[PDB]
Amino acid sequence: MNGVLIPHTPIAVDFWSLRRAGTARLFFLSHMHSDHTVGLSSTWARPLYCSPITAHLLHRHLQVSKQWIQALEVGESHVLPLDEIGQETMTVTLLDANHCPGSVMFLFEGYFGTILYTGDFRYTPSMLKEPALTLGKQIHTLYLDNTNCNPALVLPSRQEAAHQIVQLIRKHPQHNIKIGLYSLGKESLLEQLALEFQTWVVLSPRRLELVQLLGLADVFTVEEKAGRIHAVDHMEICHSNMLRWNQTHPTIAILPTSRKIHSSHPDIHVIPYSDHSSYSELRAFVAALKPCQVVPIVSRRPCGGFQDSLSPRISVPLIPDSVQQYMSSSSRKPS
Amino acid sequence: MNGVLIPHTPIAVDFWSLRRAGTARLFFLSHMHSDHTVGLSSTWARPLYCSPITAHLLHRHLQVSKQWIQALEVGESHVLPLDEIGQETMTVTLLDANHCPGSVMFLFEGYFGTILYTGDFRYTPSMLKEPALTLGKQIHTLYLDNTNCNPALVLPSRQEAAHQIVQLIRKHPQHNIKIGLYSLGKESLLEQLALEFQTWVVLSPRRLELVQLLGLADVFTVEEKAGRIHAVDHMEICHSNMLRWNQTHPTIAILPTSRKIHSSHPDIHVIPYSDHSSYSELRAFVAALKPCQVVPIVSRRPCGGFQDSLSPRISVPLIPDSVQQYMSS
């Protein structure tokens, strides 16, 4: 459950348990992976803000009512009220997180200072050239995707990992290729492979719907056996299924992931393609931004190595009177 | 972030992100409020021009190296180079902006024409008696503080608003008076209040340091409880602190500001003392200056109502060749 209640503010990100969101009033959704939507369902009855692709997927697959889903266009600043009359406001800018379709970071600006919240993301130098991040503003808290914050874990770039996958498939001209994925993500990798090997990617109807939003080449189909590359759920890649698949057609299987996965069959390949920043990329990202502090988004994973990258700490800003009133609840008063 | 890159020139004002300032070479700081120093810290390593009081404050609180700070005396014309071959120059005159300690307007003159850049300012008729503005020169672009440029927002003069505050404090002789302020500014109001009520103003050590530069009466102290008027950060004025303060001493709180703030406690008062020209003041200012063009400095806020006061436009002046080489990236 990798979401956050931002302290001293009415802001929640990827956090949907109202029982525990005592003072939260403004709700944000970075992307549609299940660990960022725990407790989010058709019963949701509060305004939430997200990217247009996330807004489409959220209504489509979790049946949150459209009236509560406020799509904000990525890369445009938006003013949002922090009290009942918009006396106090903040600016939020969504920025591409380069993690999966719809994934964004949130730059929050208001009485509380400047907060960058990465959500899940994969850093690239182009990120630091975003206009919203090139104005010299000091970031006070950086909420960081620390999924791969392990100095022992080295990863190639996505481009290099994709190259390794191309090299491997070239050695298997007569093989079907199972690509084991999560429900959302890596569609751009599927497109690169379909173009390289002049073949169709076979997908489920749910993933074909999503691909329509992405502006990718016309290389995807639901038609069974229409091409050599088959997008499958990552859990389907196992020894037992290799033995079933091979009764119809020679098959190899690829798990593009940073996770450490023992290969149980000679034709199952684990290749460290990743949609999260590597440790070295996190170090570059934080050293460039020099925030006053770093707070991990992923509670169960390590976060460290940025002590010498921080700017001098700043005192906790006072909450404006009007926002205090907005965050209050009659349930926390007597009578 | 209310700074500007003046187009067709190497001039920047209150604009410090170098990566955006590829062709800017002359940097100016109108005053030390944080929305005018976004990106300016001890990493700054270019010449920087400002008023003497701004220079003292910039080094003290942002740790810009003295070697980069070029204080220019207010009200004096200064010739500044626009290249590195001793050819093209401009003249800059700093004029009192009447906004806060150290605040200035910049009159720029050169190949680009005559540009008046107000920064933040509060207009007064004395402003127009400035010798630099009484020579009949035609201002081509007036960069204007449009914070309060709303025909519906009517404001008293600072003197009238101060009088309202005096009237309020007279009703509570047994009370401490919290005055919620920004980090810089309104020290003259604190002085007037201490003299009116024959008491001391309790300040932070930082603000006491600044007061030493202003030539104000010996009415300020950092000694706790040493007087009835307490300068506090404006964010501290809130319902919760009224309940805390009154457990020690009866307390009134005053927010001197033009912002529309709802009072959450009977004894919190918002009084429209402002350090920004009102709309009616902006109109008299522009109407007296008749610039070719008015460009707002506060892009997040509305600006208009001046087309009746503009002079006929002029074509974009040519950049001299030597200055292009200076600006080259």
Ligand SMILES: Nc1ncnc2c1ncn2[C@H]1C[C@H](O)[C@@H](COP(=O)(O)O)O1
């Ligand atoms: N702690 C945990 N438990 C179970 N399933 C999880 C967990 N974290 C992520 N996931 C699943 C959910 C997503 O569909 C997929 C990609 O998550 P990503 O975070 O982008 O790598 O991984």
Ligand SMILES: Nc1ncnc2c1ncn2[C@H]1C[C@H](O)[C@@H](COP(=O)(O)O)O1
């Ligand atoms: N041992 C283990 N158990 C459960 N989840 C794990 C484990 N190791 C990594 N992960 C998760 C972490 C990320 O959510 C995903 C890798 O993201 P990717 O884009 O695939 O690199 O796999």
Ligand SMILES: Nc1ncnc2c1ncn2[C@H]1C[C@H](O)[C@@H](COP(=O)(O)O)O1
């Ligand atoms: N857009 C914005 N965001 C956050 N804080 C701001 C902003 N504008 C001004 N300020 C703060 C900064 C100054 O210290 C104070 C007086 O600004 P003055 O411009 O003289 O009225 O108000």
Ligand SMILES: Nc1ncnc2c1ncn2[C@H]1C[C@H](O)[C@@H](COP(=O)(O)O)O1
């Ligand atoms: N709605 C709103 N939100 C945030 N800031 C605002 C708003 N309205 C005005 N202001 C700011 C603008 C100036 O910085 C300050 C007034 O300057 P002073 O000298 O205090 O009159 O208050």
Ligand SMILES: [Fe+3]
């Ligand atoms: Fe996640």
Ligand SMILES: [Fe+3]
């Ligand atoms: Fe300002």
Ligand code: NI
């Ligand atoms: Ni994710």
Ligand code: NI
């Ligand atoms: Ni100001």
